[PDB]
Amino acid sequence: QYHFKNSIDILQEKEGHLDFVIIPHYTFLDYYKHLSYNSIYHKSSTYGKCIAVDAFIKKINEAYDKVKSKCNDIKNDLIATIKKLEHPYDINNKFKKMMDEYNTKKKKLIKCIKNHENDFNKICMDMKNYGTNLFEQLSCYNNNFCNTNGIRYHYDEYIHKLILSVKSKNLNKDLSDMTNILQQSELLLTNLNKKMGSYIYIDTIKFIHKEMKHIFNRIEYHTKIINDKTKIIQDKIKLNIWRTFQKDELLKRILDMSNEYSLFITSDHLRQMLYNTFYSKEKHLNNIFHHLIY
Amino acid sequence: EVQLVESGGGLVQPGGSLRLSCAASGFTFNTYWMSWVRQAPGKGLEWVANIQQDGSEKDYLNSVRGRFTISRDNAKKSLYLQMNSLRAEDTAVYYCARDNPASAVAFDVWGQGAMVTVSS
Amino acid sequence: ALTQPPSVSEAPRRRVTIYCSGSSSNIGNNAVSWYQQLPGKSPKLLIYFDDLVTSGVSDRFSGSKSGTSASLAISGLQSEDEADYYCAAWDDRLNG
C-alpha cells in the first residue's frame, strides 16, 4: 500500500579539498530525516523525542562521513591533478602526459566509491528503518476525522523558511548569466584556435571549458527540478493542512510530502555547492587571461 | 509483537552438529539486521556473528571462524545458526540477538536463549 | 578486547562511573553502545551512537568517549540500577 523508497557528482568548491555527493544516498537520508520528524511533531508525548531523533540523524550523517576515511587518500592524489595542471610549481616545470598520468583514474575514485557502496553494512537503510519505526508509533483516534498537525509544524519550521531563500536568488537570471560566460569563452576559443599554436595552453582552456560546460548542465538540470515551470499548481501544502481526513489518506500524504522534501533539498543543496565550484574555476579561467602578458 | 523465540539447543558430544533457530513477527524481520550473542555460565557476553537483510555480508569472531554458519529465510522471518565441529568452550546460552535500525555493534533485543552444553 | 570490573552494587548516594579502556583500532574509530544485564534475565540497550537514548530508557544513564577511553555514567541510582552493565564495540584490526 504505502509506496516507500543516478549520476554522482564531484565537488571542489575550494582548491585543496574534495567531496562527492551520491545522489540516491542523499535523497534517502533526506526522505527519512523528513519523516522521523513528521511523526513526532504530530503527537504531544513525542515532542520529547525530538532531541533523540535529531541526535540519531546527526550520528547517521557521520558514520556516512566515516566512509570518506579511506576514499580520501586516493581523493587527495586526485587533487594533485591541480598541482600538475594549473599551478606548475616554481615556474620551471614545462601534452597528454598529465591527461593520462595517474590522472585518467577519476575512474579510480568512482571505483573506490562503488567498492564501499553496499559494502560496510548499510548506514542508508538504517534511516529507512528508524523513520518507518517512528511512523508506526502513532496515535490519535484514527477514525474518519484525524488532526492535520505534524506536516504544518515541519513546513513552517523547516520548509517555508528555505523556499523564500531560493525565490530571493532568482535562478533563471543565474543560468542566463552562466550561459553568456560560457558563450564568450567558446567564441574566444574559436579565435584562439584560428590564431595561436605554441607551448599550447589553449588545450587547458578547452579542457576547463568542457569541465565548466557539464557543471553548467548539472546546475541547469537541478534548477529545472527546483523550479519546474509546469507546476502542480505550486499549492500542495495548503491542500494537506487545516482540515481532517481518514487515517489511511493522511499517512499516504505524510509520505507524499516526505518525498517532495527529499528530492527538493537534495537538488538545492547540490545546486548551491556546484555554483560555488563553477565560479571557483571561472576565476581560474580568468587566471589564464592574467597570463596573457603581450 | 517483540518476539524472539529460540528453538533447539541441548547436549551433543565433542565435534557434533547443532543447528539453532529463531522466530519473530510484527517487526518485519526482512528489513532489519540480526546477530548471535552467547554467554557461558559464570562468564559474560560474547558476540558470535552478524548477517545482512539479504545475507550479502556475513561475519564471525576469530575462533569459530569457518565452523559456524549464519543464515536466514526472510520469507518466513527466521534466523538460524548451524554450528559444526562443536567444542566445549562453546558452552553458552545462545541468544538470537537482533541489531537496532542503526547498523553497528548494537543488540536491540534479546531472545530467551538456547542452552548449548558440550561435554562427554 | 574491552575491559570492565564487576561492581554496580553499592548505593549510598551520587552518580557512578564505569570506565572503559581500549585501543586505536577499536574505540578510536568505532561507535560505542551500552547494555544492562539484570541477572538471569534478558539484557537491554540504553546507549547507542556513543550517547543516544532508547525510546523509554531514562536519561540518568549516559555514554561518553575521549580518544581510546569511553565511559558509561549513570546519575541517580536506584534498586533497579544495581545490575551488571556491559558495552559493545567493534575491532577493525582483528575483525570482530
Q: Say which CATH number the domain at C64 has.
A: 2.60.40.10
Asked if residue C4 is part of any domain, the answer here is no
Which of A35, A59, A125, A134 would you mutate first to test chain B, the one with the most B CBs within 10 A? A125
Distance CA B53, CA C69 (A): 32
- Other C-beta atoms within 10 Å of C18: how many? 19
Number of domains composing chain C: 1
CA distance A79 to A103: 10
Q: Is the dihedral of CA A280, A285, A291, A292 positive or negative?
A: negative
Give the span between the Cα atoms of C35 and C88, in whole angstroms: 8
**Residues of B whose CB is below 8 A from A39:** none
Task: Report the distance separating Cα A184 and Cα A285, nearest Å.
Answer: 12
With an 8 Å Cβ cutoff, is B108 touching chain C? yes
Structural biology method used: X-ray
All 3 cell numbers of residue B73?
529465510
Q: How far apart are CA A43 and CA C92, in angstroms?
A: 41
What residues have CB less than 8 Å from A198, skipping those under 6 apart? Answer: none
Per the domain annotation, does C24 fall within a domain? yes
Contact C45 B45 (CB under 8 A): no
The CA distance from A235 to A205, in Å, is 45
Test B102 with A56 for CB contact under 8 angstroms.
yes
Q: On the CB side of C52, how many CA atoms lie within 13 Å of its CA?
A: 23
Q: How far is the C-alpha of A167 from the C-alpha of A177, rounded, in Å? A: 17
Contact A130 B101 (CB under 8 A): yes
Find the closest chain A residue to C31 by CA distance.
A63
Query: Quick one: cell of A202?
Result: 589553449
Dist CA A154 CA A160 (whole Å)? 9
Of the candidates A212, A209, A208, A221, the one whose C-alpha atom is nearest the C-alpha of residue A271 is A221
- Spatial distance between the Cα atoms of B57 and A125, rounded to a whole number of angstroms: 15
User: Where exactly are the structural domains of chain B?
Assistant: 11-107
Give the whole-angstrom CA distance, residue A272 versus residue A267.
9
Q: How large is the C-alpha radius of gyration of chain A?
A: 24
Verify whether the Cβ–Cβ distance B110 to C43 is below 8 Å.
yes
Nearest to B108 by CA among C54, A129, C56, C89: C54
**Interacting residues of B14 by C-beta distance below 8 A, sequence separation 6+:** B86, B87, B88, B118, B120
Q: Tell how strand B78-83 and strand B68-73 pair up.
A: antiparallel
Q: State the best of C46, C47, C48, C53 to mutate against chain A, taking most chain A CBs within 10 Å.
A: C53
Report CA-CA distances (Å) from A29 to A21, A64, A69, C94: 12, 10, 19, 31
Q: Is residue C76 part of a domain?
A: yes
Which residue numbers come right before each break in chain A (C to N over 2.5 Å)?
A: 5, 94
Its sign, for the CA torsion A71, B101, C25, B54, is negative
In a domain, C5, yes or no: no
Which are the contacts of B88, defined by CB distance < 8 A and separation ≥ 6?
Answer: B14, B118, B119
CB B108 within 8 A of CB B3: no
Contact status of A239 with chain B (Cβ, < 8 Å): no
Q: Kindly state whether A55 is in contact with chain B, defined as any CB-CB distance less than 8 angstroms.
A: no
Map residue A214 onto helix, strand or coil: helix
- Measured in angstroms, the CA of B33 and the nearest CA of chain A are apart by 9
The Cα–Cα gap between A218 and A211 comes to 11
For A152, the 3-state DSSP assignment is helix
Give, in words, the CATH class of B11-107: mainly beta
Q: Which residue has the cell 547443532?
A: B18
Residue B72, class by beta-carbon neighbours within 10 Å (0-12 exposed, 13-18 middle, 19+ buried)? buried
Q: Which of A186, A16, A21 is nearest to A86 (CA)?
A: A16
Length of chain C: 96
Contact of C95 with chain A, judged by CB distance below 8 Å, is answered with no
